């Protein structure tokens, strides 16, 4: 990690002192603005107590620059193939009749089909009529009856939802370190909002956003990747149209739950005298899937899956400008008076100055025991912490300059008393 | 679905170690028996959490079973001498125990637990912190609280009171107070893990984790309904037992099922197993939680 | 009858592992049921559009036919599709549930 970049002062308003007997102890209540960093830049925030041993840091991790999709109306949608059942009956024989055959309600099942047994599928039930006489079995010359009952069933195993998205909100993937040391990762996105340990954050500025996704649907596939299509959103169904036979959840797609919506009259029906054949011609959506599979070249973004959290994303570029408000809420902070000793060191120094990215630092401090370490200049421009560990590890900071021949010596005290170190490094302009 | 809201798995004991009174109808606690300690426990309108949860244990069982401690003392009287410890953590308390009865216990701070005791002829009123003169009188203890126990050894004597904003909740005395401070009774969540204190709650993410354990099945005695039966009395895969026992796959995927050559039926019960919770980000698992009515002291100013 | 679309079907012969031969077949975006599994069609880039002006006349035993006129929805009369059932036994038989326009006989 190339450790914090801004790294501001707490105001007395929003600090207080509430000490118990020479362990002195605060609390931060209150809000406090600070400037996020770019992409791998850090924003620590160091707290002063009464005194100037007391140190803590607040630095919130940066991961990139993400634009979440809101996601807005969603459907659950699916290949299924009919499974037609016929039943040739004769006229005037049970229910078989010349009247009742042909008007025949899709919502109601008789005692021709009631042994079949009840399931929560998408089911109809309807009644034609064939020919009689002794060509083919009735002793009446009316022609005979023929109920049908099919019933969807989906012959695949996977399940895909299909949505859209109305906007596309600048995510801000931050995590945000405690101060006693319970690291937390969360996210931020316009004008959002979290729980933290020691409060929460919100979003101020966030001057980037990009209007017009109506006119597109998203398409989540669970295990594999999306995918894009170009068309705009499918609300009422139709035959002829992807987004016919649609549900609610993955198992009104997997176990065809009759709770899911459809069109009536949705399944043909080819009879054959004693044959029987209902098919449908539902869109797979799978060739979609194929077809438009990300990512794919659109205007000038590209579009892919998301990390950790389970949504789509957009890869942009450019820079992270936007403001953090810290919201603190009350939260206890202790910090024991009395540090360990430890000698830092100095390895390299390279980067850049007064730009986002700014220069990281190689500091190689050796204590032995588990603190911090502050360090600052002469005239009160820069601010180093680095949490001390009994061991030689490589540390180091963003460091931003105005110059690029660098040359300035830092005041560390890691103990309370301040000792001298010398730095230097040569930088290049980026903005 | 299942309707065994009677059957207590492990031993099914509920009376306390205080007033070992009602010991003759409650041993073991199972479809019979009228135990004033259990009854209210399924009345609609009064615990619907125990309600939801009650495949699991309680509280006097948890106690019975070396899960829970007891303070000391364990059952303070009411009428002996000046002063107990037993009354600063009862008068904060609001509750509605019915009428006719005697004792009422309820969960301390220490992590252990300590009731309370009223000589005969006393009972409760209508708040039940304070035990007056006098159906009759029911020899047993009315639950205070709305919580449930469970089998856990998972060690949290590292945690306090995750509340901010607030000054002295109950008799817990966290922070200071330097303006105005509320009093009114609102209720608020806990979890008391293993040789801890009282520890409160925010946010709960609550969840069901079944597993294939013995105290997770229940079962009735089949005989020319629903009857005692001992679950212990069951044999393993191939082992031995003295009677015999039967079920369904959860049963006989793990004890010995006979069909119709036995005398009781073995069924899973819906939701027991092992229920877990999410504090402070991390997932533990608790030992009776529950919610009190308790003095909330949030600072307004 | 009419037609709305026309579905470009492939009538195809799926030969299974075993040895059983099916004869089914795909048009557009359908799908039918084999030994195997079942099968569905991709790309389809073959259609033709405007039928709604042309009905159909279907006859058991013998060829088909074709009008130069739209579907017939509603009956009245001096127009093709007047008197109208929904089954076989409807017109040879005539059945009373069949649909026509009132007034229909003259009396002289």
Same mark, same amino acid.
């Given at each position: ?20 007997? #020479? ?33 803590? @840091? ?24 009919? &499974?037609?059942? /016929? ?10 009749? !010349? ?25 109809? +039930? ?17 022609? /005979? %009856? ?70 597109? /649907? ?33 198992? $009104? ?6 709770? %899911? ?25 799978? #060739? ?14 590209? @579009? ?11 890869? $942009? ?22 540090? !360990? ?14 730009? +986002? ?23 009160? $421009? ?7 560990? +009994? ?32 730095? &230097? ?7 | ?301």
């Amino acid at each position: 990690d190339p450790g914090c970049s801004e790294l501001i002062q707490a105001s007395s308003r929003i600090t207080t002192c509430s000490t118990e007997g #020479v362990n002195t102890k605060c609390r931060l209540s209150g809000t406090a603005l600070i400037r996020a960093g770019s992409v791998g830049a850090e924003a620590c925030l160091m707290l002063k107590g009464v005194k100037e041993d007391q140190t803590k @840091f607040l630095k919130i991790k940066t991961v990139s620059s993400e634009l979440s999709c809101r996601e807005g109306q969603s459907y659950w949608t699916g290949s299924f193939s009919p &499974k037609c059942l /016929s039943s040739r009956r004769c006229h005037l024989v049970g229910e078989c009749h !010349v009247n009742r055959c042909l008007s025949w309600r899709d919502n109601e099942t008789s005692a021709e089909f009631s042994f079949v047994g009840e399931s929560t599928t998408m089911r109809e +039930n309807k009644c034609f009529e064939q020919c009689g006489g002794w060509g083919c079995g009735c002793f009446n010359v009316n022609p /005979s %009856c023929l109920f049908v009952h099919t019933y969807l069933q989906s012959v695949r195993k996977e399940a895909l939802r299909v949505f859209n998205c109305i906007d596309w909100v600048h995510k801000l993937t931050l995590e945000i370190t405690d101060f006693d040391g319970s690291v937390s990762t969360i996210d931020l996105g316009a004008s959002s909002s979290r729980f933290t340990n020691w409060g929460s954050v919100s979003l101020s500025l966030d001057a980037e956003g990009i209007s017009g996704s109506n006119s597109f /649907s998203f398409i989540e596939s669970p295990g594999k990747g999306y995918a894009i299509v170009d068309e705009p959103f499918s609300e009422i169904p139709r035959q002829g149209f992807l987004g016919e036979i649609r549900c609610n959840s993955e198992s $009104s797609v997997l176990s065809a739950h009759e709770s %899911c919506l459809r069109a009536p009259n949705l399944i043909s029906y080819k009879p054959m005298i004693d044959q029987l054949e209902c098919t449908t011609n539902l869109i797979d959506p799978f #060739v979609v899937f194929e077809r438009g599979s990300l990512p794919q070249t659109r205007n000038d973004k590209t @579009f892919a899956a998301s990390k950790g959290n389970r949504g789509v994303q957009a890869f $942009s570029k450019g820079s992270v400008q936007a403001d953090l408000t810290l919201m603190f809420d009350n939260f206890e902070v202790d910090f024991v008076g009395a540090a !360990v000793s430890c000698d830092a060191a100095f390895l390299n120094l390279t980067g850049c100055y007064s730009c +986002n990215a700014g220069a990281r630092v190689c500091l190689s401090i050796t204590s032995t025991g588990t603190g911090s370490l502050s360090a600052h200049n002469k005239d009160g $421009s820069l601010h180093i912490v680095l949490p001390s560990e +009994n061991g030689t590890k490589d540390q180091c900071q963003i460091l931003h300059f105005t110059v690029p021949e660098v040359e300035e010596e830092f005041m560390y005290s890691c103990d309370g008393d301040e000792r001298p170190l010398l730095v &230097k490094g040569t930088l290049i302009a980026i903005d | 679905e299942d309707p065994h809201l009677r059957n207590r798995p492990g031993k099914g004991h509920n009376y306390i170690d205080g007033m070992t009174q009602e010991d003759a109808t409650c041993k073991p606690v199972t479809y019979a028996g009228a135990c004033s300690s259990f009854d209210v426990l399924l009345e609609k309108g009064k615990f619907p959490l125990f309600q939801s949860y009650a495949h699991h244990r309680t509280l006097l069982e948890a106690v019975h079973d070396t899960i829970i401690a007891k303070a000391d003392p364990p059952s303070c009287d009411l009428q002996s001498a000046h002063g107990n410890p037993c009354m600063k953590e009862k008068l904060v308390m609001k509750t509605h125990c019915p009428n006719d009865y005697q004792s009422a216990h309820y969960l301390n701070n220490d992590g252990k637990m300590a009731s309370v005791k009223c000589p005969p002829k006393y009972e409760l009123t209508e708040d039940c912190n304070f035990c007056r003169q006098m159906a009759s009188l029911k020899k047993g203890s009315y639950p205070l609280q709305d919580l449930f126990c469970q089998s856990s050894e998972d060690d949290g004597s590292k945690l306090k009171t995750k509340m901010k904003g607030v000054c002295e909740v109950g008799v817990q005395a966290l922070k200071k107070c330097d303006g105005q401070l509320s009093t009114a009774h609102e209720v608020v969540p806990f979890a008391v893990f293993k040789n801890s204190k009282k520890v409160y709650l925010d946010k709960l993410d609550l969840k069901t984790e079944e597993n294939l354990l013995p105290d997770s099945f229940v079962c009735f005695e089949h005989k020319g309904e629903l009857k005692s039966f001992d679950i212990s009395q069951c044999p393993k895969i191939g082992g031995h037992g003295s009677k015999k026992c039967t079920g369904d796959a959860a049963f006989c995927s793990a004890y010995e099922c006979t069909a119709q050559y036995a005398n009781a039926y073995c069924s899973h019960a819906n939701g027991s197993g092992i229920v877990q919770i999410q504090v402070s980000g991390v997932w533990k698992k608790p030992l009776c939680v529950g919610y009190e009515r308790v003095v909330v002291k949030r600072e307004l100013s």
